[PDB]
């Protein structure tokens, strides 16, 4: 559960929530300078507020570490005590939020939708005078159950009195209401309201821009990240620790790229994950470290990748984001058992293309061209103000990949390999559907993102990137 995240509270409400309803060790997280977050913790009868910043690459906690998601941050600190501080700050008791705004089924002020979009077990909750309504589709019919709100507690007319709509919903999901004549009011899935027909994107973007709808949709997607805390054990191994750019941003074990090139102790690790929507696939990875450049080339060779997308400069804000893992133009280099030649560099307005020749030392017949698309103009913080640049680049990447018979996954990297990497990958997935199925196709932005996030932690980091994905898809349809 992610109940410790309160979307509509202020620092004062946070202080009062913790002081009157919490104990020492009680905590919550909340949004802010908008785009920022706060971890409010009770310690020795007083409330401490800790800043969490995210400009697009990772959640950066003051006096703490860098994380892929707020759920991974909270999971880590509740499990590993002494890491948050010079005195230590302990996260013991999540202070639960009763607000249903970030719930998939909660539709505030609202049968047409349930009849059109719904199926057996599709449900929603809307607001009635201070009471609520639970609308369910079964089959086929729609049944409305009234939700009474009496003294801050919710009930369906009898039985238990719930402290939140979430507790009521979860209860009647486990224990369904049965009608006298035998209809089981099964709450299988929330009604889908995010799937749109691609030709109607401008209309959805206009509605999401109204007071903003993008924030509510994004925060509801963020609330589902608690279902994605998959094991990341391999990345934690002692021998793998210095192979991670950020110690707490790790690849899921179930999708990590396993290296079999093996020099005969622990030669099978890279901080990278296969992303499936081979030739139609991606490898999402971090910017190389000096000690992972050989592993990077071993991955590229093994997976038969012919295209690399780099979405960072080597250096941003005087900080190294990715080592230069490729030779200078016309130069030849050996990176362990792999040999790379940089044949030619071509400079475009937003990017540089490097034509590389990769082969294994001692084996001539293993040579293949690897095209490196280096996007150089993405801002240091936030996202581009216009997506034309990104789209033109992605179009070029897509055509290069399409032209190469049996090419492996497209390798995509930035610094941590989750924010800009996730953004470019999601735009590419969505645009690919519009290529195949045409403008009369269905697209579901948060569905696509949730699917990518189950393959690598925190793919698509911010609300600014979320909105950029909608703008990029809108611009692609408008230029069709
Ligand atoms: C079914 O799901 C799962 C099944 C099995 C494993 C996991 C699992 N995978 N990763 C994590 N993490 C992240 C993490 C863990 C350790 C370190 C770390 O470097 N080490 C090693 C030396 C000291 C320690 C330390 O820094 O204190 C860094 C990170 Cl980021 C957690 O926090 C975590 C917390 C509660 C439960 C599982 C966790 N879990 C799992 O999710
Ligand atoms: C008004 C409201 N409270 C805010 C918007 N809203 C929704 C609904 N569903 C998703 C969704 C879709 C597919 C996968 C995943 Cl994981 C998610 Cl969470 C979403 N992001 N927002 C509807 C309710």
Q: Does the fold of domain 103-190 match that of domain 1-102?
A: yes
In whole angstroms, give the CA distance from residue 347 to residue 119.
52
Asked if residue 242 has its Cβ within 6 Å of ligand 1, the reply is no
Could you tell me whether strands 410-413 and 307-310 are parallel, antiparallel, or unpaired per DSSP bridges? parallel
414 labelled catalytic: yes
Q: Name the resolution in angstroms.
A: 2.1
Q: 398 C-alpha to center of ligand 2: Å?
A: 29
Q: Counting atoms of ligand 1 from 1, which one is nearest the CA of 80?
A: 27
Task: With H, G, I as helix, E, B as strand and everything else as coil, classify residue 66.
Answer: strand
Helix, strand, coil tally for the chain in percent (to 5): 30, 25, 45
- Backbone phi and psi for residue 388, each to the nearest 5 degrees, phi listed first: -50, -45
State how far the alpha carbon of 447 is from the alpha carbons of 120, 192, 409, 451, in Å.
Answer: 20, 10, 22, 6
Tokens 């979430």 locate to: 166
Q: Give residues after which the chain gaps, C-N over 2.5 angstroms.
A: 32, 85, 110, 128, 139, 211, 264, 277
Q: Does the beta carbon of 80 lie inside 6 Å of ligand 1?
A: yes
User: What is the DSSP annotation of 228-280?
Assistant: G-----GGGSGGGGGG-SSTT----TTTBPPP-----------SEEEE---TT
**Torsion angle (degrees, nearest 10) of CA 274, 278, 280, 282:** 20
CA neighbor of 5 nearest in space, from 23, 26, 30: 30
Q: Which H helix or E strand runs over 298?
A: helix 293-303
Instruction: Kindly indicate whether the domain formed by 1-102 is annotated with CATH number 3.30.505.10.
Output: yes
Q: How far is the CA of 107 from the centre of ligand 2 (A)?
A: 10
CA distance 214 to 7: 14
Phi–psi pair at 35, nearest 5 degrees:
110, -15
Output the CA 39–ligand 1 centroid distance in Å: 20
Q: Name residues whose C-beta falls within 8 Å of residue 472's C-beta, 6 or more positions apart in sequence.
A: 387, 390, 391, 427, 431
Site to substitute for ligand 2 among 217, 222, 445, 459, most atoms within 8 A of C-beta: 217
DSSP codes, 347-401: E-SSEEEEEEEEEETTEEEEEEEEEEEEE--S-SSS--S-SHHHHHHHHHHHHHH
Rounded to 5°, angle at Cα 418 from 35 and 9: 25
Helix (H) or strand (E) holding 21: helix 11-21
Residue 217 CA, ligand 2 centroid: distance in Å: 5
Give residues with Cβ within 8 angstroms of 89, minimum separation 6: 41, 43, 48, 50
The closest residue, in CA terms, to atom 23 on ligand 2 is 104
Ligand 2, residues 214, 221, 454, 469: which to mutate, most atoms within 8 A of Cβ? 221
CA angle 25, 54, 383 (to 5 degrees): 160
d(CA 401, CA 389): 19
With a 6 A CB cut-off, is 236 part of the ligand 1 pocket? Answer: yes
DSSP strand pairing (26-31 vs 93-94): parallel
CATH architecture for the domain at 191-480: Alpha-Beta Complex (3.90)
Helices (H), 46-127: 70-79, 112-116
Radius of gyration, alpha carbons of the chain: 25
Comparing CA positions, the residue from 109, 377, 24, 69 lying closest to residue 249 is: 69
Q: What is the secondary structure of 124-184 as a DSSP string?
A: EEEE----EEEEEEE--EEEEEEEEEETTEEESSSS--BSSHHHHHHHHHHS-EE-TTS-E
Q: Which residues of 467-479 are buried (b: 16+ CB within 10 A; e: fewer)?
A: bbbbbbbbbbbee
Residue 52, strand partner residues? 37, 61
Give 22's contacts (C-beta < 8 A, 6+ positions apart): 42, 93, 95
Diameter of the chain measured on Cα atoms: 80
- Write down the domain spans for the chain: 1-102, 103-190, 191-480
What approach was used to elucidate this structure?
A: X-ray
CATH T-level assignment (fold) for domain 103-190? SHC Adaptor Protein (3.30.505)
């Amino acid at each position: 559960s992610r109940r410790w995240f309160h979307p509509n509270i202020t620092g004062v409400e946070a202080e009062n929530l913790l002081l009157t309803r919490g104990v020492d060790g009680s905590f919550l997280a909340r949004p802010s300078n908008p785009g920022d977050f706060t971890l409010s913790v009770r310690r020795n009868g007083a409330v401490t507020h800790i800043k969490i910043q995210n400009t697009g690459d990772y959640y950066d906690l003051y006096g703490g570490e860098k994380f892929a998601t707020l759920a991974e941050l909270v999971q880590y600190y509740m499990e590993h005590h002494g890491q948050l501080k010079g005195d230590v700050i302990e996260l013991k008791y999540p202070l639960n939020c009763a607000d249903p705004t970030s719930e998939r089924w909660f539709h505030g002020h609202l049968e047409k939708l349930l009849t059109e979009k719904g199926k057996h077990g599709s449900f929603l909750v809307r607001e009635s005078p201070g009471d609520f309504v639970l609308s369910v589709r079964t089959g086929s019919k729609v049944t409305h159950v009234m939700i009474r709100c009496q003294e801050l507690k919710y009930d369906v007319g009898g039985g238990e009195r719930f402290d939140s709509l979430t507790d009521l919903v979860e209860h009647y999901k486990k224990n369904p209401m049965v009608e006298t004549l035998g209809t089981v009011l099964q709450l299988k899935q929330p009604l889908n309201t995010t799937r749109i027909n691609a030709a109607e994107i401008e209309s959805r973007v206009r509605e999401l821009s109204k007071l903003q709808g993008f924030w509510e949709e994004f925060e509801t997607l963020q609330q589902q990240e608690c279902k994605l805390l998959y094991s990341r054990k391999e990345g934690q191994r002692q021998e793998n620790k210095n192979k991670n750019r950020y110690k707490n941003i790790l690849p899921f074990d179930h999708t990590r790229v396993v290296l079999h090139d093996g020099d005969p102790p622990v030669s099978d690790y890279i901080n990278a994950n296969i992303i499936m929507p081979p030739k139609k696939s991606y490898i999402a990875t971090q910017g190389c470290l000096q000690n992972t450049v050989n592993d990077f080339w071993r991955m590229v060779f093994q997976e038969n990748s012919r295209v690399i997308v780099m979405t960072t400069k080597e250096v941003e804000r005087g900080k190294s984001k990715c080592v230069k893992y490729w030779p200078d133009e016309y130069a030849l280099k050996e990176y362990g058992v792999m040999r790379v030649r940089n044949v030619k560099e071509s400079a475009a307005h937003d990017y540089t293309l490097r034509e590389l020749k990769l082969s294994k030392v001692g084996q001539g017949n293993t040579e293949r061209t690897v095209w490196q698309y280096h996007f150089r103009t993405w801002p240091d913080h936030g996202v581009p103000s216009d997506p034309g640049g990104v789209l033109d680049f992605l179009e070029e990447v897509h055509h290069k990949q399409e032209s190469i018979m049996d090419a492996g996954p497209v390798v995509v990297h930035c610094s941590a390999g989750i924010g800009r990497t996730g953004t470019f990958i999601v735009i590419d997935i969505l645009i690919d559907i519009i290529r195949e199925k045409g403008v009369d196709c269905d697209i579901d932005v948060p569905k696509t993102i949730q699917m990518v996030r189950s393959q690598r932690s925190g793919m698509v980091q911010t609300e600014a990137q979320y909105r950029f994905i909608y703008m990029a898809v809108q611009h692609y349809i408008e230029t069709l």
